[PDB]
Each structure stands twice: as C-alpha cells, then as structure tokens.
C-alpha cells in the first residue's frame, strides 16, 4: 500500500552500513553539463523499482569525491544520488544552491537512460556539507516541491531560511569552521515554526565528520530521506523519542512523528 516503500523493516544497525541495493555509478564530466561542474551518480541496480532523487553538494574547496561514501551509502538504501562538483571550488553557498538546482534538472532530464529508468522525478531532496549545507537551506527555500533537506555541518552568512521543506540539520560539537552556535543552531531555530524540523549535534565530532563514514550521519540522513522522500513511516522509530549516546543536542517541533 505505500508505493514508494523500499527495503526491509529498518534496524539502527542496518542504517550504519550500506543497504540492501547493489549500486552502479556514472561519472558526469564537467564538459557534459552546464550550470554545475559535473559529479557522480550513484543508483540502485538489480531492481525493477524506482526511487526518489537526491542532489548533494560538498563544501568550500571540496569536490564530489570527498562525499562518495555517503553517495554509495544513500544509494544502497534505495535512492538515485547525484553528488556534484561546483563550477569553482570557491563557490559560496548561494552559488551551490543554483548548482544543486541545475543538477536536479539534469538528473531528471539528461542523465543516462539507465539512471532515469530508476528515478521518480516527482520525489527529490537535497543534502550538503558545509557551504553545500548552506546551499541545501537556500535551494529548499527556492524549491518548495523538494521532499526533504539535510544540511551537514552547514555554513552560511544568512541565518534565516523561509522554507516549508522538512529540514534535519546535523551539527558537530567540536566544529571550529562552522561553530554550532553561529551556524547549525541558528539555522534550525530561525526555520519557520510550521516547517517540520530536527536538529542533531554529534558528540566528539568536528567539521570533517561528514567526509568519512559516520554511523550517526548515516542513521539520521537515511531516516529523514526515507520518511519524507518515500513517506516511509517505518523510519519514525529513529526520529521520535530518540535516546542516542552519539548525540549531544536534539531539537524538534515534533511535526514528523504522526
């Protein structure tokens, strides 16, 4: 009865490793696209189902390769994921928002046949690291049809995003690049009270925590994407009355548990 539901009934343990789908990859050359610097698509194979799309942005100086682990992790749980490179490694967060937008358009329209075969273009979300997380907040505001947004250790000079798109922000307690009280926390607090939102802060973690496999980032990112991209209420268990020793801050307006 949920036509977007994929994969077995989840356990926390299952969400800390690659999921039940085999993953194929497709390198998107910078030359082959406009509006962004290419990147890589991670998509399920050996399946006759379709999945929602996620576009993901790395941060300042970084490229898509840094977040490959999370591209594979999300795709393996049943998503078409395009991790972008930026036109310039120095692009700021509002530029990254424009480039995520171009990437979603390409994903739905000009990606390979095999990729569009596995894509439900009606169900799209965004995530990103650092300035890529600032661009995640900005594109959410610009594209209300997006199902979810997951800024990871986000950085932006703008602290207020007027988005209706459900947002889960991951902060890192020992982040010195985008300190939580000046970035992650105000982003969360300044989002509309009517918008479903969650803030989680990683204990014993720094700005670079999203650049390598991280059990907590995997659990909360997969769970938020599942709940909102797939309407998969089985993932509420990870998001509702949580007691996670990996988390040092948990905040919600409780619009996601019912």
UniProtKB/Swiss-Prot annotation:
E.C. no: 3.1.1.74, 3.1.1.101
Name of the protein in its database record: Leaf-branch compost cutinase
Catalytic activity: cutin + H2O = cutin monomers; (ethylene terephthalate)(n) + H2O = (ethylene terephthalate)(n-1) + 4-[(2-hydroxyethoxy)carbonyl]benzoate + H(+); 4-[(2-hydroxyethoxy)carbonyl]benzoate + H2O = terephthalate + ethylene glycol + H(+); an acetyl ester + H2O = an aliphatic alcohol + acetate + H(+)
InterPro entries: AB_hydrolase_fold (IPR029058), FrsA_esterase (IPR050261), PET_hydrolase/cutinase-like (IPR041127)
Stated regulation of activity: Is inhibited in vitro by diethyl pNP-phosphate (E600), but not by EDTA.
Temperature sensitivity of activity: Optimum temperature is 50 degrees Celsius with pNP-butanoate as substrate. Optimum temperature using PET as substrate is superior to 70 degrees Celsius. Shows 70% of the maximal activity at 30 and 70 degrees Celsius with pNP-butyrate as substrate. Has half-lives of 5 hours at 50 degrees Celsius, 80 minutes at 60 degrees Celsius, 40 minutes at 70 degrees Celsius and 7 minutes at 80 degrees Celsius. Is thermostable, with a determined melting temperature (Tm) of 84.7 degrees Celsius.
Compartment(s) of residence: Secreted
Chain sites annotated for binding poly(ethylene terephthalate): 60, 131, 155
Main localisation: secreted
PTM comment: The disulfide bond between Cys-240 and Cys-257 contributes not only to the thermodynamic stability but also to the kinetic stability of the enzyme.
Noted pH dependence of activity: Optimum pH is 8.5 with pNP-butyrate as substrate. Shows 70% of the maximal activity at pH 7.0 and pH 9.5.
Stored PANTHER family: DIENELACTONE HYDROLASE DOMAIN-CONTAINING PROTEIN-RELATED (PTHR22946), POLYKETIDE TRANSFERASE AF380 (PTHR22946:SF9)
Keyword field contains Transmembrane: no
Family, similarity comment: Belongs to the AB hydrolase superfamily.
Molecular function terms, GO-annotated: acetylesterase activity; cutinase activity
Active site: 130 (nucleophile), 175 (charge relay system), 207 (charge relay system)
Other known facts: The gene encoding this enzyme comes from a leaf-branch compost metagenome. The source organism remains to be identified. However, it is presumably a thermophilic bacterium.
Keyword set, alphabetical order: Disulfide bond, Hydrolase, Secreted, Serine esterase, Signal
Known function: Catalyzes the hydrolysis of cutin, a polyester that forms the structure of plant cuticle. Shows esterase activity towards p-nitrophenol-linked aliphatic esters (pNP-aliphatic esters), with a preference for short-chain substrates (C4 substrate at most). Cannot hydrolyze olive oil. Is also able to degrade poly(ethylene terephthalate), the most abundant polyester plastic in the world. Can also depolymerize poly(epsilon-caprolactone) (PCL), a synthetic aliphatic biodegradable polyester.
Keyword Signal: yes
One GO CC term, this protein: extracellular region
Pfam families reported for this sequence: PETase
Cystine bridges: 240-257
Biotechnological applications: The engineered enzyme with mutations Ile-208/Cys-203/Cys-248/Gly-92 can hydrolyze PET in a highly efficient way, ultimately achieving, in less than 10 hours, a minimum of 90 per cent PET depolymerization into monomers, with a productivity of 16.7 grams of terephthalate per liter per hour. It was also shown that biologically recycled PET produced from enzymatically depolymerized PET waste exhibits the same properties as petrochemical PET, before being processed into bottles, thereby contributing towards the concept of a circular PET economy.
SUPFAM superfamilies: alpha/beta-Hydrolases
